[PDB]
Design a binder for this molecule. Sequence first.
Ligand SMILES: Nc1ncnc2c1ncn2[C@@H]1O[C@H](COP(=O)(O)O)[C@@H](O)[C@H]1O
Ligand SMILES: [Mg+2]
Length: 487
Amino acid sequence: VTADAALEPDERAAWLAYNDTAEDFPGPHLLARLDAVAREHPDRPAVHAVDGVWTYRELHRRADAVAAFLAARGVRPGSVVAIAATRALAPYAALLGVLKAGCAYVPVNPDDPADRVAFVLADAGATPLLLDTDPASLPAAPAPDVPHEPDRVCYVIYTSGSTGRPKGVVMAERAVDNLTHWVVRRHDVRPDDRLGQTAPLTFDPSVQQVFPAWATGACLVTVPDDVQRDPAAFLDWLRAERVTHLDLVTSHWVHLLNAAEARPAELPDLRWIIIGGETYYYHQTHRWHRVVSSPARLNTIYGPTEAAVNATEHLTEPDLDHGQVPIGVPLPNYRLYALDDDGRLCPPGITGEIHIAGAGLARGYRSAEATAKAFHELEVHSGRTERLYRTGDLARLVRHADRWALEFQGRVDSQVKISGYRVELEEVDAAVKAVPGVRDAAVVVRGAEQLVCCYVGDVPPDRLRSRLTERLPAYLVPHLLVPVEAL
Ligand SMILES: Nc1ncnc2c1ncn2[C@@H]1O[C@H](COP(=O)(O)O)[C@@H](O)[C@H]1O
Ligand SMILES: [Mg+2]
């Protein structure tokens, strides 16, 4: 009956040890800890963005004005509110103000195609009030009296899902609080620290940097767009800004490694890089530690948006120089299982599909159908019935050093990543062919870091590029638009 029924006692025992991850965290709930920091450290720098730096006192005052504005416009607790994801100060007042109002934020890239923004607002049930007026200039006010309700939704974040089928992941407070406690404790986040935010607010590694900063008194430092596409400049910016903690996707880190090998870097203030997204190898991380002079350690993480940013972690050993880096052990209060096509727990060493349980799970998606397809219930061990999120990722349980660890093995479908962004190449196919004048087109992955398109048409590449930005997010516009006589 159970999922582990066919396993031998040793195989069962390995999974039981792997998922022995309960941990109790103290203090009040997440927003109360944010307010406590603001009360105790009003003068500390809370956010450093392209147009200046706000103290905790000022960030919370601006957020209070957002919350009062929302209430005055009939936005009651439990609503969803879009925020414009930029690299300036305003989005931070917006997102904090939304939470202070008892609401959840949905981050929107104001440069994204209008059609896609429209879907997000509709699917998220979100008001655009804060997209249409500067949140940072709203009339000053005290924060409205919002009662505490447990496990309020905090954000809805969209992932590409399938073509024509964006998925809005609904994340509630207990998951975000658990994640925040983990970031702070695992990486020793302290009030003097400076947490860089590489990901835009539309991608969930930003959550991992923003809330641990504000829950400790540290400074959130947004990484400017003009340094991200220049890896050499990014390395010098990390030095100049004295950054202590940094989020990176694997493919972006590979560009940094290449820049570091071209000009080795000293980063004495950097202590943690929380890195993940794609498989990488000890021959790469060994190269990194040779050319980056820094105490910085690489914490490899894995996990879908549907399970609160990360689900597993592995501290990368700098001395190892070959083999695949494992994705590691579950975060506190997470449990993960490798299941075969029938739903039985795989023995150690056998590749199965990852199913995730525990404190990090999303409420679900905004859409009921997507929720019913991915979230289910299963008795994995005798007496343990789990709510599970089905990931579509493949992995196997292995011995690494003297403990069990998951090792990533790929996916069950054709989803791939380009410069660290999920892509269905068919979606890019359909966009280019939809441009009037384009007769046919084929989009190919070049690297990891390059999307190359060959197209038959009477339209010059510069003009096709202009048409595609109106239709695709910028990161899905192919890097090379090559006109060909025939494919
Ligand atoms: N450390 C990793 N190694 C390999 N694949 C990963 C890793 N982290 C995330 N992924 C993949 O990227 C998907 C989305 O996760 P994320 O990029 O963290 O939002 C996952 O479902 C996996 O397919
Ligand atoms: Mg993740």
